[PDB]
Amino acid sequence: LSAEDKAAVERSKMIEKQLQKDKQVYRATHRLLLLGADNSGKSTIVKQMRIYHVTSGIFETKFQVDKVNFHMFDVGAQRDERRKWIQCFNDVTAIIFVVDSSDYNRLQEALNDFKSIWNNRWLRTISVILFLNKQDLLAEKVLAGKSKIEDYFPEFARYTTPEDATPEPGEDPRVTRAKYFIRDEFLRISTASGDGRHYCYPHFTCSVDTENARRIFNDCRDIIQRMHLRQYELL
Amino acid sequence: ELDQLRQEAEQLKNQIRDARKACADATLSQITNNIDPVGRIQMRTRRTLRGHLAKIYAMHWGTDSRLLVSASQDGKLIIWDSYTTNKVHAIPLRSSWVMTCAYAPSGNYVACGGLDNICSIYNLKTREGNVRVSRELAGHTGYLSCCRFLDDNQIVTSSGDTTCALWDIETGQQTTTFTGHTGDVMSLSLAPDTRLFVSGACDASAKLWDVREGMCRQTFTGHESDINAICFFPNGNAFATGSDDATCRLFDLRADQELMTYSHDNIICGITSVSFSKSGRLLLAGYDDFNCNVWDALKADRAGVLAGHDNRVSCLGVTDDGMAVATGSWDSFLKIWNGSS
Amino acid sequence: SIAQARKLVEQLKMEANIDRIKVSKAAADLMAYCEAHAKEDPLLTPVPASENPFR
Amino acid sequence: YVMGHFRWDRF
Amino acid sequence: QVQLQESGGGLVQPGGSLRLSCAASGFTFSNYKMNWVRQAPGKGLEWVSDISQSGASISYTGSVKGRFTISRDNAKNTLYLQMNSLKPEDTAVYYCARCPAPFTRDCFDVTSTTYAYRGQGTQVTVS
Amino acid sequence: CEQVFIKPEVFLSLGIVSLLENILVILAVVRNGNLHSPMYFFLCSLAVADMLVSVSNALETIMIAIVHSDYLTFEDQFIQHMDNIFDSMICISLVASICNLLAIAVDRYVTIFYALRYHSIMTVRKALTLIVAIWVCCGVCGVVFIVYSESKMVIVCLITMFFAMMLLMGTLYVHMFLFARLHVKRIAALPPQHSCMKGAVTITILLGVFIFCWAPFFLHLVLIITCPTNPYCICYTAHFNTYLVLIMCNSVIDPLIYAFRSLELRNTFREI
Ligand SMILES: [Ca+2]
Numbered sequence A: 001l002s003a004e005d006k007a008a009v010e011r012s013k014m015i016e017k018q019l020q021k022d023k024q025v026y027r028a029t030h031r032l033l034l035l036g037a038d039n040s041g042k043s044t045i046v047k048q049m050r051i052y053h054v055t056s057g058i059f060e061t062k063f064q065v066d067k068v069n070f071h072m073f074d075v076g077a078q079r080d081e082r083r084k085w086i087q088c089f090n091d092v093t094a095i096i097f098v099v100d101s102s103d104y105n106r107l108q109e110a111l112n113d114f115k116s117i118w119n120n121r122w123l124r125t126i127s128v129i130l131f132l133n134k135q136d137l138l139a140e141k142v143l144a145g146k147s148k149i150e151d152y153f154p155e156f157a158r159y160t161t162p163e164d165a166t167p168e169p170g171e172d173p174r175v176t177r178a179k180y181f182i183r184d185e186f187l188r189i190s191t192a193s194g195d196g197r198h199y200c201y202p203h204f205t206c207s208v209d210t211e212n213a214r215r216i217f218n219d220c221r222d223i224i225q226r227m228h229l230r231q232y233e234l235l
Numbered sequence B: 001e002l003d004q005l006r007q008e009a010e011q012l013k014n015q016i017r018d019a020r021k022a023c024a025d026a027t028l029s030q031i032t033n034n035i036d037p038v039g040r041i042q043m044r045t046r047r048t049l050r051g052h053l054a055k056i057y058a059m060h061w062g063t064d065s066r067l068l069v070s071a072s073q074d075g076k077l078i079i080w081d082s083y084t085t086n087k088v089h090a091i092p093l094r095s096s097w098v099m100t101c102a103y104a105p106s107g108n109y110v111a112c113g114g115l116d117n118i119c120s121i122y123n124l125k126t127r128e129g130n131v132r133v134s135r136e137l138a139g140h141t142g143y144l145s146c147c148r149f150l151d152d153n154q155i156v157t158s159s160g161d162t163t164c165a166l167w168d169i170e171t172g173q174q175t176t177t178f179t180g181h182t183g184d185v186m187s188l189s190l191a192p193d194t195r196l197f198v199s200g201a202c203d204a205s206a207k208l209w210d211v212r213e214g215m216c217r218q219t220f221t222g223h224e225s226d227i228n229a230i231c232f233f234p235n236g237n238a239f240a241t242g243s244d245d246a247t248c249r250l251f252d253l254r255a256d257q258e259l260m261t262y263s264h265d266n267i268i269c270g271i272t273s274v275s276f277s278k279s280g281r282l283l284l285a286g287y288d289d290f291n292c293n294v295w296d297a298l299k300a301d302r303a304g305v306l307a308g309h310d311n312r313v314s315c316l317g318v319t320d321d322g323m324a325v326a327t328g329s330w331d332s333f334l335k336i337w338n339g340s341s
Numbered sequence C: 001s002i003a004q005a006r007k008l009v010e011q012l013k014m015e016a017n018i019d020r021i022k023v024s025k026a027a028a029d030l031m032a033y034c035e036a037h038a039k040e041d042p043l044l045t046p047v048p049a050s051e052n053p054f055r
Numbered sequence D: 001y002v003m004g005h006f007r008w009d010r011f
Numbered sequence E: 001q002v003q004l005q006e007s008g009g010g011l012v013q014p015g016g017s018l019r020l021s022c023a024a025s026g027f028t029f030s031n032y033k034m035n036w037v038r039q040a041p042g043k044g045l046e047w048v049s050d051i052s053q054s055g056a057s058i059s060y061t062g063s064v065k066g067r068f069t070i071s072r073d074n075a076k077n078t079l080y081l082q083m084n085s086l087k088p089e090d091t092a093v094y095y096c097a098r099c100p101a102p103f104t105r106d107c108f109d110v111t112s113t114t115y116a117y118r119g120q121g122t123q124v125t126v127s
Numbered sequence F: 001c002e003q004v005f006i007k008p009e010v011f012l013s014l015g016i017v018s019l020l021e022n023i024l025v026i027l028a029v030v031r032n033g034n035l036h037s038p039m040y041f042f043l044c045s046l047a048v049a050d051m052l053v054s055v056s057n058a059l060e061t062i063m064i065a066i067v068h069s070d071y072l073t074f075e076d077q078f079i080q081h082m083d084n085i086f087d088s089m090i091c092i093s094l095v096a097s098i099c100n101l102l103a104i105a106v107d108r109y110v111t112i113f114y115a116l117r118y119h120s121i122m123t124v125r126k127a128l129t130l131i132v133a134i135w136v137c138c139g140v141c142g143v144v145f146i147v148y149s150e151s152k153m154v155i156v157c158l159i160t161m162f163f164a165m166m167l168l169m170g171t172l173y174v175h176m177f178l179f180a181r182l183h184v185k186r187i188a189a190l191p192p193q194h195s196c197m198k199g200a201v202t203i204t205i206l207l208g209v210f211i212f213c214w215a216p217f218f219l220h221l222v223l224i225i226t227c228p229t230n231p232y233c234i235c236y237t238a239h240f241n242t243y244l245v246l247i248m249c250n251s252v253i254d255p256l257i258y259a260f261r262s263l264e265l266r267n268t269f270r271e272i
Helices: A003-027 A042-048 A107-119 A135-144 A173-192 A212-231 B002-022 C002-015 C033-037 F008-030 F038-068 F076-113 F124-147 F152-188 F195-226 F231-237 F240-257 F263-271
Strands: A029-035 A059-065 A068-074 A094-100 A127-133 A200-203 B044-049 B056-060 B067-072 B076-081 B086-092 B098-103 B109-114 B118-123 B132-138 B144-151 B154-159 B163-168 B174-179 B185-190 B196-201 B205-210 B216-220 B227-232 B238-243 B248-252 B258-262 B271-276 B283-287 B291-295 B305-307 B325-328 B334-338 E003-006 E010-012 E017-025 E034-039 E045-051 E058-060 E069-073 E078-084 E092-098 E122-126
Touching: A003 A029, A003 B076, A003 B086, A029 A042, A029 A212, A042 A068, A042 A127, A059 A212, A068 A212, A094 A107, A094 A212, A107 A127, A107 A173, A107 E045, A127 A173, A127 A212, A135 A173, A173 A200, A200 A212, A212 F076, A212 F152, B002 C002, B056 B325, B067 B098, B076 B109, B109 B144, B118 B144, B118 B154, B154 B185, B163 B185, B196 B227, B205 B227, B216 C002, B238 B271, B248 B283, E003 E092, E010 E017, E017 E092, E017 E122, E034 E078, E045 E069, E045 E078, F008 F038, F008 F240, F008 F263, F038 F076, F038 F124, F038 F240, F076 F124, F076 F152, F076 F240, F124 F152, F152 F195, F195 F231, F195 F240
Parallel strands: A029 A068, A029 A094, A094 A127, A127 A200, B056 B098, B098 B144, B144 B185, B185 B227, B227 B271, E010 E122
Antiparallel strands: A059 A068, B044 B334, B056 B067, B067 B076, B076 B086, B098 B109, B109 B118, B118 B132, B144 B154, B154 B163, B163 B174, B185 B196, B196 B205, B205 B216, B227 B238, B238 B248, B248 B258, B271 B283, B283 B291, B291 B305, B325 B334, E003 E017, E017 E078, E034 E045, E034 E092, E045 E058, E069 E078, E092 E122
């Protein structure tokens, strides 16, 4: 019990004080992993979402919705091999997966990437908020009449709009059919294997849309609520 | 022309394989039967260290075998004194995603690295009231996985860009770049004499790199999947690689050939960290089965188990005097284990 | 393309030249390390609880 | 004293 | 070393038939998931077909479900893809790919630009 | 109708079993690092309340045995003053059990319906503040209930407390179940042991154990106050000891539908 031990315990106490003050901030935030590809409007989603905000391998965007904090991580400037660093993201609240719906060529690559995310170990409890970006391009593409979607997906001639679809005003049935066909392509992978431990929330987002933060808010709410309602043996 | 180079590569590969299969007269299982079995080596949690919020990904002891640094995904390095479970320093980070740490032999420096693709060198012994960021080595293309000091102005790093590098701290630039890995590098271990260093990557391959020549020295295969950890035997005459196929293996650097394969039918989960005791007789290895196993390097029997973690065991390190064993896991606990008589 | 394969062959021809040694003495360097350090490894043979900084 | 388990059995 | 040496390939008229075979050496063949990945001239690497550890699950892509078929035997370390009723788009280099980890249903980086556990490729040309 | 007596063996056996279970729960919480959240402090508090109910009734049972038997004939004065302590202990544990059950319920409601701000309004310091406040108020109410017993308002206070803390618990759990029903409906709309049945079973157990283990006793108290001579009530009041056994069986059941319905404590118990 010298003076050295006294100074040591004083240092430990001050450090634990800082640790508690930092834990309060840490547990009061939600971390989100943003994934996608080059053709997706991922950069546009990040940039247009820099509103009301409070070389490099990681970019971090902090945004607050209704006095709740969100951290979003974009993995820039790393190699294509992803089987190793994605393991670091098992404690995140959600994975925001952005997909080019108006591509018709690389869309099966997007499905395979999403399938790998869904079935991956260390990610069997992390829910995926699925954004189907660039909707106006799809609208004009399946309205103009070129590049038929039947030729890349042959399960389309025998697809009728699900009755629970909610088209926007002034929208052709063909745009609705394609728009929900792609969502069904993703959701078929979503519900095929994963148990009730996580779910996939799709949204028909656009690059210029000014509402994505609110959607992330609502689906993070749903994620936490579903988790806790399964722990209570309700649901 | 290109197919001619393919045929030349095939011919060299066959020559290497035949020469290797020549000098393999006795398997180590046959020449260790007379060796008495280790028995049963049980260990108990002498200390448990708490204070990390999230997963612990890295952990390194020091030259004095008292202080140890630990790195967590909450953006925090803590320098614990395992004797008294105190905390001497708690450095926050710029990037909250860190996968490696080191601790310079002189005790004056620590290092960190992660998905930010930067090796941050932190200066500890300064004595004015704060811990400053001495340097930020930048220039890697992928994520860093392991960095280890040679001295106070030379560091080696392993990156996800399929390379390793030797950096000069004061200069800031890369002095040498070690290329030759097809996949991304997971782990590097420096020789006891600080003269060579071994590296193991996702392609099932480990190699020696000569520090002062910048060139590869040997190469070793035998694994089925990614090599996740690597560590030197108490001399630069062996090293043990744990791979993602749930198998450990021992590689010599004289014979240039696999030596032993540690595995079990039950083991299906991979391997995260390996280390050797200060005898070459206790190879400790963490697993994704939420447990760490003791192995013996001359008989390929378990001869030891070590459980007590609620999640994946992500770190491992013995002391320079052989007295303790630190294990950090994804449950944010650092367990300092010691045996008893 | 061609240069990459040429470099691979040039580095690979270095590999088939190193002076290998037979295992029976490449496995006798080990198993002699342990026989010379089994009396100073705390984890293999536990230290008496008096001179053990961890209690 | 009349004694018994707990109280308020009667009033 | 994870070796995947391929057979088959060559020039076949449109509407032809072929059987690509990929012989594997250097790893436990039974406990891995495997795939076919083709690269057409002037295009990126895309994904054709997939078969699981025991062959119970077979999957393809849209532009392949009616023509190509995936199979695998475990006693002989080979992966087979039977091709018939080909099209001009089918002309490409082909690679047999192995999913990184054993005893897992996860196939990361199978179509990557650089990949350790991939074949050298067989050219399949169709007039 | 004649007053009903039951063997002391029942009280002793239930006390031993419940004390075992609650000690096991508290050790299982202490022996697991990942479970120092506010939700398990309430479970430990409830285990303490249950064990105090059990041991208090057990000690009073043994002492009823020691007094009814001729062995060690105690003075008339000793038994009254030395009873009041045990009955105060039973009342304190009785009230505290209800208050901890409501604490668990309110915490679960806050967790569900305030899902993103939960960690900013239920810090561990607040959890321990509420726990200690509960226990001090329960202690003061228990001592002032036993000491001031024959007064009329002590029984009315208990009846109001229990009926309030019955209907509040019911509303909270039914709201949670209806929300879960809505969520499950929104999961059935996906493109491709029913969940409603699972939630209904859970809510029916959590409310019916509470009712059928506590409400008989407070129905007894209401009959004591209101209707003391009509044979429509005397036959109910004849079973005091059976209602006490119901309360102790609740103390047995409680650390079985609240603390053992979590895989964390389940695997901790399996390990130990
Ligand atoms: Ca009494």
